[PDB]
Amino acid sequence: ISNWKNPKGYTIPLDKRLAADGRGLNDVEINDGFAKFSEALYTVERQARE
Amino acid sequence: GIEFMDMYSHLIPVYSVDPMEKICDAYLDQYLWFEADRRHLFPSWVKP
Amino acid sequence: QELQSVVQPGSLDSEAGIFASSFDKTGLRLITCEADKSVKIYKQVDNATPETHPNLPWTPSNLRRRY
Amino acid sequence: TSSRALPAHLKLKYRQESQGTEEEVRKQDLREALLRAEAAHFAT
Amino acid sequence: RRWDEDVVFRNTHKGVDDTPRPGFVNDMLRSEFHKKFLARFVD
Amino acid sequence: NAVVLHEDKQYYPSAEEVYGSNVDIMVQEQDTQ
Amino acid sequence: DSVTIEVRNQLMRNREQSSLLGQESIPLQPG
Amino acid sequence: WTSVAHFNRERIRRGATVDKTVAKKNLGRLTRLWLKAEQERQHNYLKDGPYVTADEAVAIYTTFVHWLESRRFQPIPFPPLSYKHDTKLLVLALERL
Amino acid sequence: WPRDARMRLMKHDVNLGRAVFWEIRNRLPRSLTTLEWEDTFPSVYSKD
Amino acid sequence: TLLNRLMSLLMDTNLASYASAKNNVVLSYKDMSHTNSYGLVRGLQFSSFIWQFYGLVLDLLILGLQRATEIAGPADAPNDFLHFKDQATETSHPIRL
Numbered sequence A: 001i002s003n004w005k006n007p008k009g010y011t012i013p014l015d016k017r018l019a020a021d022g023r024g025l026n027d028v029e030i031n032d033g034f035a036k037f038s039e040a041l042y043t044v045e046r047q048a049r050e
Numbered sequence B: 001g002i003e004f005m006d007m008y009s010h011l012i013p014v015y016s017v018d019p020m021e022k023i024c025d026a027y028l029d030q031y032l033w034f035e036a037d038r039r040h041l042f043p044s045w046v047k048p
Numbered sequence C: 001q002e003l004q005s006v007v008q009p010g011s012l013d014s015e016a017g018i019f020a021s022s023f024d025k026t027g028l029r030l031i032t033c034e035a036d037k038s039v040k041i042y043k044q045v046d047n048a049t050p051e052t053h054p055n056l057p058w059t060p061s062n063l064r065r066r067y
Numbered sequence D: 001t002s003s004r005a006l007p008a009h010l011k012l013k014y015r016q017e018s019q020g021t022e023e024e025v026r027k028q029d030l031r032e033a034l035l036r037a038e039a040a041h042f043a044t
Numbered sequence E: 001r002r003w004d005e006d007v008v009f010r011n012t013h014k015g016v017d018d019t020p021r022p023g024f025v026n027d028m029l030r031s032e033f034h035k036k037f038l039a040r041f042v043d
Numbered sequence F: 001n002a003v004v005l006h007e008d009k010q011y012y013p014s015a016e017e018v019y020g021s022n023v024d025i026m027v028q029e030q031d032t033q
Numbered sequence G: 001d002s003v004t005i006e007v008r009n010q011l012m013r014n015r016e017q018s019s020l021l022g023q024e025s026i027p028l029q030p031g
Numbered sequence H: 001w002t003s004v005a006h007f008n009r010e011r012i013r014r015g016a017t018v019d020k021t022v023a024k025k026n027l028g029r030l031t032r033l034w035l036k037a038e039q040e041r042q043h044n045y046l047k048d049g050p051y052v053t054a055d056e057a058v059a060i061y062t063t064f065v066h067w068l069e070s071r072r073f074q075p076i077p078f079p080p081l082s083y084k085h086d087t088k089l090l091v092l093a094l095e096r097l
Numbered sequence I: 001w002p003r004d005a006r007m008r009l010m011k012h013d014v015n016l017g018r019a020v021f022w023e024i025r026n027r028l029p030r031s032l033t034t035l036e037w038e039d040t041f042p043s044v045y046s047k048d
Numbered sequence J: 001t002l003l004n005r006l007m008s009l010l011m012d013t014n015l016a017s018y019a020s021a022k023n024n025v026v027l028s029y030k031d032m033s034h035t036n037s038y039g040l041v042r043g044l045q046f047s048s049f050i051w052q053f054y055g056l057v058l059d060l061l062i063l064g065l066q067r068a069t070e071i072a073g074p075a076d077a078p079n080d081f082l083h084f085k086d087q088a089t090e091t092s093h094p095i096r097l
Helices: A014-019 A033-049 B019-039 D022-027 D030-043 E032-041 F015-019 G002-015 H002-014 H020-048 H054-070 H086-096 I011-026 J002-010 J013-022 J047-053 J056-063 J065-072
Strands: B002-006 B011-015 C018-023 C029-034 C039-043 J026-029 J032-035
Touching (some): A033 H054, A033 J002, B002 H020, B002 J026, B019 H086, B019 J013, E032 H002, H020 J032, H054 J002, H054 J056, H054 J065, J002 J047, J047 J056, J056 J065
Antiparallel strands (some): C018 C029, C029 C039, J026 J032
16 A cells, blocks of 8 residues: 555555654654753853843 | 755755745745844854 | 574564575686675685584484375 | 678687697696695795 | 863864775665765755 | 864774774775876 | 743743853752 | 666766756656655654753753843844834835745 | 966975865864865965 | 754744654655655745854854954944954954854
8 A cells, every 4th residue: 555656546544644654763862962951051041141 | 955956077966845934944044144244253254 | 404594684573585596617706696686605604623513413213204 | 791700710719739739738747746836936 | 271271171083094995885765876965965 | 071173073983993903905096007 | 840940940941141241040849 | 767867967967968857857856856855854863762862952942041141131032013114114015935 | 277376385384274174164163064185275475 | 952952042933843754754766765853954035044053153163263253343333345444453364254
């Protein structure tokens, strides 16, 4: 079941089209280094302001 | 949207933005450049 | 002897394959053309010594072949 | 008939004396030559 | 030296080299050739 | 602890790391004749 | 609640303006 | 596919072709390849964290703050409702569009 | 340019140009920008 | 994020936040799409200004605060394009222009 074309009508329910992808295998996580990075930017920003 | 303009030696990236957001961006651009020039933010050596 | 071909670093695991091969004129070097965009040369181990380099074990008289 | 089917290269070329004919390859010793060449390459 | 002691970053490129010449990666999308090609033809 | 820049990233081991030290690795990109 | 505390801190950070303005400050409760 | 794209783009750069179709095909291939590389670059950025360290960011912020306070820079305010020049800025932007 | 109007590649001048490039490149963090030698050309004026 | 924190210095928090969030868009060519989260989108109408003051930061990094102050001169009385107030300050550093 292709996301691009099909020569005949051949309606496919949405669940089957959704099931045909590799979205789950691709993880969505963020590095830990952002937490220390942003906080440092927030710390110095307050320090300079005071 | 994104597309490339062919110069046959390099490709220029061209971005297509929604019209209303384009109006808002253009007004913000004009306002920011007028305020920055009025307040002397860029010290003469930035070009153009 | 059983040997498993190992791909060069950029390839995938599924990219291991062999398409062409030939012994040289003497027969001491084997040239293999792989499905990996690489050519590999295989040489018999020089030290020999059948005591220290045994072949795969041979188990006789297990059963007649089906044929 | 066709332009590309006209006669061309009507003389077949055979390997000459010093070009590596069958006689010389049979006379030559390829094994020790190969090992010597490999050692010469290794030396670099 | 007193002409470079004002600055805030030093030796930022201390241990960088040219290019991995012996490296031949069998992946046309990750090779050095493709990276240079993209960095040249796209600006 | 050091960060790896995108241009400095390596995805694959060196041919030495994958073939051992008793194999000579030849990379003949360019012609010699 | 820890979440409502985090909302409290982020709302005050939202009210915090540019550093050059040199306005007042509010030390934030930990937790 | 990628090898053909490289060859055709080099030919186009030299100037050995005059096809519109070949130029358009190669432009499409280059766009696809560049977008693949860019998606990989963004994904690597999310994986490997912020390339600029915390110390570098602190140093850059400190230098910029010191520079701005040395030149007594008055920060730009949000444009009030009663701004004299709003119509003029608006018409300038509209003309540029 | 016709040479004798180009840069004469004296050892001292070349080393000075490369030293200047090295210093300026080290001035900048690698995480936000970098200077490539293939895009840089420091031209030296001296007694040579 | 560093861009947002820097832009917060020049202008109001609302304007800085708008300009920072405008750069984090979804770029789509044909069937390909991705979220731009690391680079700078040059297609925005104010991307010119955003780049101009981010590159004044790099100018400060390259020159340093003292040399930049010497070149630009006092904020109330800025120097000319390629001139200095006096020869003493002009010749006091290897960097002239």
